[PDB]
């Protein structure tokens, strides 16, 4: 009887009892620990975004993608992600990684200027780069035909497509990247089907553009086509990412750090090892993971 | 507004030292390029130069390379057409004019839009 | 030098009629670094038109630019009193930029 524990009910509160058991964990380690062995993907001065679009200002596999929520690196040509909260979703569950040139720079765009397509806006050792997995093609001297790719999937994976649509500022540099004044864009999959128009627009110097570049990406099931037809303004893709799903892996935006240590669960406060089955200390968990509760003890 | 004022008439005897000022105002001087166009009496109009305000680099015409001088002060957000000695020759008009170009930062000029009011340079003894 | 040569030397017309004017270059340059410009006596230049087909800020519906192979057109719907000047084109491709020869657009009588 020598327990000095205590119990609540709904009419009485703090009632001393003899035997009785915790349910609640809220003890943790500030680290960032490896889930079950595999380690962390962590995005330093660098967001999602810039890394898989390949923003040159920035791993196969991971058991969890972290991010710095003070990291910006991003989008070095000022525009819009399409989806981009959708992408992170898909992104969550995430185990193998193949990254692929899905149209290389070499051969896949014969009558098109694949080598002029870099700007200062995306700089890179001081020099005017762009983003590693994604092409700006521009007209071949004068002549920029109606180009149509088409990638099947072999890999067997979710194929990851990533393509941008460029937007002039004046009507004259239209004429000058692409010439074809009424130039459009056509993205076609089994699950995903898009025409692309150019808003011809000048906006504020966002990164010293003008012009706007909008990002937009879809996977592409194994066996399915996706065709990239295009008379202008459609930044290809270079490199695509067939990848395998896991289940219990998503994505934690914490400054804590990250360490060698172990762990069964993992919160962006910090790692869990309990036999508890709930917990107090964050409602993000990643792993088996005793569910969160707000409550002081249980 | 958007316009440029350049500098006053000006009348001197071959051999002498002249600049001539061009002043941009109301815009981002140094985002445009800024260029010299010489017109003869009773001749067409003679491309000169351009120079980018914030790169103070210069690009001269082979008929007036080494001749005349094209100077820029972005800072005081003015370009200058700075003469080593005159020559009779260069009884003309001066036009500066700030130059149309692509917004992606590729090299394609468009031409020139805002010009400035024209210097009248007169050279004789 | 790029030589262009315009043509014609002259054109008379009388205000409302349509006017054409041509710029055949030495060599092949590209069409986004020609430009039309207006000038009137005693007055600085203007533009009309930029990048060969682009027209500049602040002028009417009336003025277009035209290209297809060296020929380079300016072409105006309705004459009004004022569009009677000089009238110059201009490429700024090869280095040095050349003017036209100008063609002189004259109240016909």
């Known amino acids: 009887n020598n327990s000095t524990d205590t119990v609540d009910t709904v009419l009485e509160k703090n009632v001393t009892v003899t035997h009785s058991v915790n349910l609640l964990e809220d003890k943790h380690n500030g680290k960032l620990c490896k889930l079950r062995g595999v380690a962390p993907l962590h995005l330093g001065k660098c967001n999602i975004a810039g890394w898989i679009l390949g923003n040159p200002e920035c791993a196969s596999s991971w058991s969890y993608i972290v991010e710095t929520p003070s990291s910006d690196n991003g989008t070095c040509y000022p525009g819009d992600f399409i989806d981009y909260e959708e992408l992170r979703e898909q992104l969550s569950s995430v185990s193998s990684f193949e990254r692929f040139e899905i149209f290389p720079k070499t051969s896949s765009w014969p009558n098109h200027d694949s080598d002029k397509g870099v700007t200062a806006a995306c700089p890179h050792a001081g020099a005017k780069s762009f983003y590693k997995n994604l092409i700006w093609l521009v007209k071949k001297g004068n002549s920029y035909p109606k180009l149509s790719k088409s990638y099947i999937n072999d890999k067997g994976k979710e194929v990851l497509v990533l393509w941008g649509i460029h937007h002039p500022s004046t009507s004259a540099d239209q004429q000058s990247l692409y010439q074809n004044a009424d130039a459009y864009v056509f993205v076609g999959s089994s699950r995903y089907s898009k025409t692309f128009k150019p808003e011809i627009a000048i906006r504020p110097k966002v990164r010293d553009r003008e012009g706007r570049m909008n990002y937009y990406w879809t996977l592409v099931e194994p066996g399915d086509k996706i065709t990239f037809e295009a008379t202008g303004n459609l930044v290809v893709p270079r490199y695509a990412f067939a990848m395998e799903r896991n289940a219990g892996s998503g994505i934690i935006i914490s400054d804590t750090p990250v360490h060698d240590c172990n762990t069964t669960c993992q919160t962006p406060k910090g790692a869990i090892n309990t036999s508890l089955p709930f917990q107090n200390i964050h409602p993000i968990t990643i792993g088996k993971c005793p569910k969160y509760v707000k409550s002081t003890k249980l | 507004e958007v316009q440029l004022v350049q500098s006053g008439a000006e009348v001197k005897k071959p051999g002498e030292s002249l600049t001539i000022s061009c002043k941009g105002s109301?815009?981002?001087?140094?985002?445009?390029?800024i260029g010299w166009v010489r017109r003869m009496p009773g001749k067409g109009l003679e491309w000169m130069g351009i120079?980018?305000?914030?790169?103070?680099?210069?690009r001269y015409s082979p008929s007036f390379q080494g001749q005349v001088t094209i100077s820029a002060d972005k800072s005081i957000s003015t370009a200058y057409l700075q003469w080593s000695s005159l020559k009779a020759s260069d009884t003309a008009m001066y036009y500066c004019?700030?130059?149309?170009?692509?917004?992606?930062?590729?090299?394609?000029?468009?031409?020139?839009?805002?010009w400035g009011q024209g210097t009248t340079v007169t050279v004789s003894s | 030098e790029i030589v262009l040569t315009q043509s014609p030397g002259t054109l008379s017309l009388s205000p409302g009629e349509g006017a054409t004017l041509s710029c055949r270059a030495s060599?092949?340059?590209?069409?986004?670094?020609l430009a039309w410009y207006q000038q009137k006596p005693g007055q600085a230049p203007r533009l009309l038109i930029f990048?060969?087909?682009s027209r500049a800020t602040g002028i009417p519906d009336r003025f277009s630019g035209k290209t297809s192979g060296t020929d380079f057109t300016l072409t105006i719907s309705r004459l009004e009193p004022e569009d009677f000047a000089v009238y110059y084109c201009?490429?700024?491709?090869?280095?040095?930029?050349?003017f036209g020869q100008g063609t002189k657009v004259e109240i016909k009588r």
């Open positions: 060599q092949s340059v590209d069409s986004s670094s």
């Open positions: 109301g815009y981002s001087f140094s985002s445009y390029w």
């Open positions: 120079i980018n305000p914030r790169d103070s680099d210069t």
């Open positions: 004019a700030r130059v149309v170009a692509d917004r992606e930062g590729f090299g394609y000029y468009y031409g020139m839009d805002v």
């Open positions: 990048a060969g087909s």
């Open positions: 201009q490429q700024c491709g090869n280095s040095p930029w050349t």
